[PDB]
Amino acid sequence: MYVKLISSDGHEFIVKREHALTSGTIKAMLSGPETNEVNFREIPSHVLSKVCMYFTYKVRYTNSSTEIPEFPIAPEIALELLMAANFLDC
Amino acid sequence: MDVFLMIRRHKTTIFTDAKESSTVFELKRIVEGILKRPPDEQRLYKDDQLLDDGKTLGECGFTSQTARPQAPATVGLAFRADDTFEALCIEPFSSPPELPDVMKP
Amino acid sequence: PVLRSVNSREPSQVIFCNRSPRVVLPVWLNFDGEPQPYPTLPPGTGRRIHSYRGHLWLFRDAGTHDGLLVNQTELFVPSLNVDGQPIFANITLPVYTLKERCLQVVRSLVKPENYRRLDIVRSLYEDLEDHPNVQKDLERLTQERIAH
Amino acid sequence: SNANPPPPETSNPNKPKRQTNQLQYLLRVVLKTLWKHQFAWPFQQPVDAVKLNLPDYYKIIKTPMDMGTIKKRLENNYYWNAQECIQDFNTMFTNCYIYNKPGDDIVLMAEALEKLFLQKINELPTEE
Ligand SMILES: Cc1ncsc1-c1ccc(CNC(=O)[C@@H]2C[C@@H](O)CN2C(=O)[C@@H](NC(=O)CCCCCCCCCCNC(=O)c2cc3c(cc2CS(C)(=O)=O)-c2cn(C)c(=O)c4[nH]cc(c24)CN3c2ncc(F)cc2F)C(C)(C)C)cc1
Numbered sequence: 408m409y410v411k412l413i414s415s416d417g418h419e420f421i422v423k424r425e426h427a428l429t430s431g432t433i434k435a436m437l438s439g440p441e442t443n444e445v446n447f448r449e450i451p452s453h454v455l456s457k458v459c460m461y462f463t464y465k466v467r468y469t470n471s472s473t474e475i476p477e478f479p480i481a482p483e484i485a486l487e488l489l490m491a492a493n494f495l496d497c
Numbered sequence: 498m499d500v501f502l503m504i505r506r507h508k509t510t511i512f513t514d515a516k517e518s519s520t521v522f523e524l525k526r527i528v529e530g531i532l533k534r535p536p537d538e539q540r541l542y543k544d545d546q547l548l549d550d551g552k553t554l555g556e557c558g559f560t561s562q563t564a565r566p567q568a569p570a571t572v573g574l575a576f577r578a579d580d581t582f583e584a585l586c587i588e589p590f591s592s593p594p595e596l597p598d599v600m601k602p
Numbered sequence: 603p604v605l606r607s608v609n610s611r612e613p614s615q616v617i618f619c620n621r622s623p624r625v626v627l628p629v630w631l632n633f634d635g636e637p638q639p640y641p642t643l644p645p646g647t648g649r650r651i652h653s654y655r656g657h658l659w660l661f662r663d664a665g666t667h668d669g670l671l672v673n674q675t676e677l678f679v680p681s682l683n684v685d686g687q688p689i690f691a692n693i694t695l696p697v698y699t700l701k702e703r704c705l706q707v708v709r710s711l712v713k714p715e716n717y718r719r720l721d722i723v724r725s726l727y728e729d730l731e732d733h734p735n736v737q738k739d740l741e742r743l744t745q746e747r748i749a750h
Numbered sequence: 751s752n753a754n755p756p757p758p759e760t761s762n763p764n765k766p767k768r769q770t771n772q773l774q775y776l777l778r779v780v781l782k783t784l785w786k787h788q789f790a791w792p793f794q795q796p797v798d799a800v801k802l803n804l805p806d807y808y809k810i811i812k813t814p815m816d817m818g819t820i821k822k823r824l825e826n827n828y829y830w831n832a833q834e835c836i837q838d839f840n841t842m843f844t845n846c847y848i849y850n851k852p853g854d855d856i857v858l859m860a861e862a863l864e865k866l867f868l869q870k871i872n873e874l875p876t877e878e
Contacts, residue, residue: 416591420510420512421512422512454591458700460569461567461703463512463569465697474695476565478700480704480707482596485600486721486722487594488700492704495700497699599716641859651855
């Protein structure tokens with residue numbers, strides 16, 4: 408049911424595997440003939456917690472007939488978040 | 498009505514959703530499934546307030562408008578440490594760098 | 603052009619409803635496929651409009667040209683009003699990818715001349731400079747229509 | 751009386767031609783900004799009252815004006831000074847407010863162009 412995503416600084420993030428599959432990179436890493444844990448040496452916890460929030464948002468609001476709220480991003484995390492989204496392919 | 502949560506203890510963060518009508522005990526059962534510690538060995542918190550097992554999340558102040566997928570509410574977790582519960586301690590995440598000058602209003 | 607309004611002259615009442623946190627630019631595609639923007643709608647507001655059968659519309663963020671959805675899709679074409687009932691055009695935010703949402707936020711904080719002063723990888727400069735726009739999107743929607 | 755009349759003149763040998771730094775600003779800065787505006791499209795050419803089925807348009811609107819005429823005039827050095835050009839933009843807007851009902855979508859587009867026009871015109875250089 409769940410996967411553990413560990414940030415570069417050692418924080419553990421336990422999310423539903425289905426939610427973490429929102430990332431094309433994580434989906435490929437977990438693919439193939441299981442692995443329940445993924446480390447990210449280059450993504451810090453302030454960024455990885457935000458990526459996990461986006462996974463929840465994507466799964467909740469994709470295909471929903473209820474109006475979608477804005478996914479918020481503070482200016483302080485924007486560049487690092489952009490770099491993580493680009494690597495994770497989500 | 499779904500409430501989106503971050504159950505945090507030390508450097509562990511569980512992302513999970515639950516109903517407003519669901520109980521604090523039902524949340525402890527989620528934690529036991531992941532972190533392998535029984536409900537009686539857990540203490541759940543909203544800020545510094547210890548939550549009662551039989552209370553529904555809604556009765557604890559966790560609402561849908563304040564526990565969103567994109568901005569989840571935090572539930573503190575404290576595990577049993579021998580004959581006493583450990584002090585509630587949530588390690589904060591890393592800090593972003595100083596905001597670049599080309600991003601300042 | 604494949605993406606254009608049909609000159610029907612058959613009136614059709616439409617309700618443009620902005621259910622997004624953005625200011626909406628309703629864009630009417632004329633009889634030659636050209637985008638012809640109409641007055642904006644502030645977030646949470648709506649307005650009746652005298653439109654016509656076969657007229658083709660798309661909805662954009664008025665300040666950045668980010669693509670919006672209408673009735674959970676990209677384009678809107680109203681049918682003839684059955685018994686005077688208006689046709690509803692519900693405009694909402696799409697679930698943008700995290701990378702497109704991050705590009706939107708950086709673009710809103712950084713002037714285009716300062717993109718190359720950001721401590722990000724080279725390929726992220728080209729992505730920031732590739733601003734969303736109606737013409738870019740019309741070619742893609744046309745190439746999807748050819749396939750489907 | 752449907753047929754559209756001949757458009758406004760944009761060149762006259764008997765009317766004095768003239769170039770100033772204000773008339774260059776009105777073309778390169780004001781007209782250029784308004785021409786590229788998202789709401790410029792109903793104002794870039796004379797109102798085709800026939801094709802658009804606009805009753806009494808040229809009966810009610812005695813001094814028709816559009817941005818194409820102003821642009822061609824600016825380009826031909828038709829105006830004597832900036833005020834002569836500014837009067838033409840005002841007439842284009844006023845024509846819209848007169849003919850169309852207050853609150854129409856065309857009137858909102860004219861109001862956005864006019865608001866922008868006044869801002870640009872507020873920074874008209876002193877004639878030098
Ligand atoms: C008549 C009425 N009865 C009772 S309620 C009512 C009514 C009608 C419309 C509306 C607002 N609903 C719309 O707009 C809708 C939305 C969308 O479906 C388009 N659509 C239309 O209605 C269109 N019709 C039709 O398809 C049916 C008739 C087909 C005519 C075929 C020939 C058209 C040539 C197309 C190219 N030419 C333009 O596109 C254009 C439109 C326009 C003005 C100037 C031009 C350029 S040009 C040929 O003159 O060089 C214009 C300018 N100026 C300075 C005025 O002062 C005006 N006063 C009225 C108009 C103007 C008409 N107009 C226009 N109007 C409203 C706008 F918001 C934007 C506009 F551009 C247009 C845009 C063409 C009017 C509200 C109430």
